[PDB]
Symmetry: C2
Subunit: 322 residues, 2 copies
């Protein structure tokens, strides 16, 4: 019932902003402005099927994805909101596991869930559980990361292996026989991103969820009016993900990630940035993958250095991967 | 494609924050701090069935509800996020109508939709359309509205008639035979609330959505450690809503409102506050309904001044009223 669900929310997420709260949380603005001059603000909804998977669950994901959307601006995520849409009859055991994981993930990341909402719909009106989170943090005045700034000669990096999350979910949903080898990379990336905070050569940073790295590179190119060239052989792809690629013929560049950055840097900063990423556990597999060029468009270099236009796909590999 | 949906979003909601955006909106903190010392931050999900109804729709509702949750703090709402969950095959005519109403409601209220998300699920996995919005605004330093401040002697008012929204949806969903008599009160309340901004004796404001006025007075009582006594005869209830009460035996105090305030005021300010409310189109039916008292608990005064404990109901009158 509604009262048990509300009690679960309040107990699990309990903090000084949520307690004694009325219709809204009330956040100290002086504290935020002391951290930075801009407030980063993002929202995402989470409709992943299944709810639980190797490496995470919808609840952990709902904190990670939104914390990362904030964190890639250079801001430390501090406050999140949470809206649950529940299907009547969802086992309490399942809801409790999701909420427990959300609360733990937020607690570990130093994030407070300061406000929320729960709606219950009848059986069949929603598939089990959907979550929306919105988040905020203050962007330090000296950090100016954006793709509009990119110019010919800039280097493109990824913080780790590509397509782990997408491949994990595809394997589960389509029963591809790789259970035990694939794991989601779902993680809060703030500690990794903060290694880059004082490095002058860092120019743009984005996480690569829906649409994977392919979407990001196309977004980067559209923003700066320059082209981007990616080396296919330079792409770090785990053996189990390669296995999914082989079976389905689908691109690891198109697979959603839930713990990876695409980073654009000044040419002379590339080795310094790689070293910073390699020093942190979340950046251990970071690699150079490409370059910003004068010639517009996105190209992938295959065999014998042949550069071919890299198209965006028409749809995601499968519905509800995130 | 769902790039049709993303195009609808960007076109309808277009503003400087949404354009050339990467993973997050970026909001000027100095401007917020100059307005107030606290940031009000709220979120609500909207799962109303049906999507369109007399007096509004899910889109207008998604703006109103979240704007109101911010505005009851004293803050002027400035920025909203918007997360859509869409069922595959939802007619574009429906979605366009929803988005248009959202855009027009936001524009009229001077609210910018600065960031968002869309997720699409398969047929049967969600009932047509769900929306989450989160919103923010700065609370002026000199406004200290809070339920915790209430003391014995304070007067309770409502800003209009009770249960119009809930009753409208109940009549539609349960086919009670009152079509054309009932209309939802869905409205952005900021202009009404701002009549009270400079009135010294205003102590607490809440909107009265889920659980209605009954939930608000219970929340007030819990926050301040004082009791609340309500006059049953003083409750303003329209004839058609009374008709729903008569048919179902259900209480207008429990029915959801989507354009009503419950206001607590210093005893001496009651006449001034009532006149201020009556001066605005949205507060014409405002009324005194009770008082805060020393004896703890919530009581309803019936025939012959008999005061009886007013219990909260176990469930909402029906799922998906909001």
């Amino acid at each position: 019932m509604q009262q048990l669900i509300n009690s679960l929310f309040m107990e699990a997420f309990a903090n000084p902003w949520l307690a004694e709260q009325e219709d809204q949380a009330r956040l100290d603005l002086a504290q935020l402005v002391a951290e930075g001059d801009r407030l980063a603000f993002s929202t995402d909804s989470y409709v992943i099927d299944p709810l639980f998977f190797p490496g995470g669950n919808i609840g952990k994901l709902a904190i990670c994805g939104t914390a990362n959307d904030v964190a890639v601006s250079g801001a430390i995520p501090r406050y999140l909101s949470c809206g649950f849409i529940l299907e009547e009859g969802l086992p309490m055991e399942t809801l409790k596991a999701v909420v427990t994981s959300m609360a733990e993930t937020a607690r570990t990341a130093g994030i407070a869930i300061v406000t929320g909402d729960t709606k219950v719909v009848q059986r069949g009106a929603a598939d089990k559980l959907f979550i929306n989170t919105a988040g905020m943090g203050a962007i330090p005045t000296n950090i100016h990361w954006g793709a509009q700034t990119l110019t010919a000669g800039d280097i493109l990096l990824v913080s780790g292996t590509l397509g782990d999350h997408g491949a994990t979910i595809l394997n589960l949903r389509e029963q591809l026989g790789l259970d035990g080898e694939l794991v989601s990379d779902c993680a809060v990336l703030t500690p990794l991103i903060q290694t880059l905070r004082d490095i002058p050569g860092v120019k743009a940073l984005r996480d690569a969820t829906r649409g994977g790295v392919n979407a990001v590179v196309h977004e980067f190119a559209a923003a700066c009016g320059c082209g981007i060239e990616i080396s296919e052989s330079a792409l770090p792809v785990k053996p189990a993900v390669r296995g999914v690629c082989e079976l389905l013929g689908l691109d690891a560049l198109n697979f959603a990630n839930e713990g990876k950055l695409v980073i654009a840097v000044e040419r002379n900063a590339a080795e310094q940035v790689l070293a910073a990423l390699h020093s942190h556990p979340l950046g251990k597999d970071a690699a150079l993958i490409g370059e910003v060029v004068e010639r517009k468009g996105v190209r992938l270099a295959g065999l014998y250095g042949v550069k071919r236009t890299l198209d965006l796909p028409h749809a995601e590999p499968l519905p509800r991967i995130c």
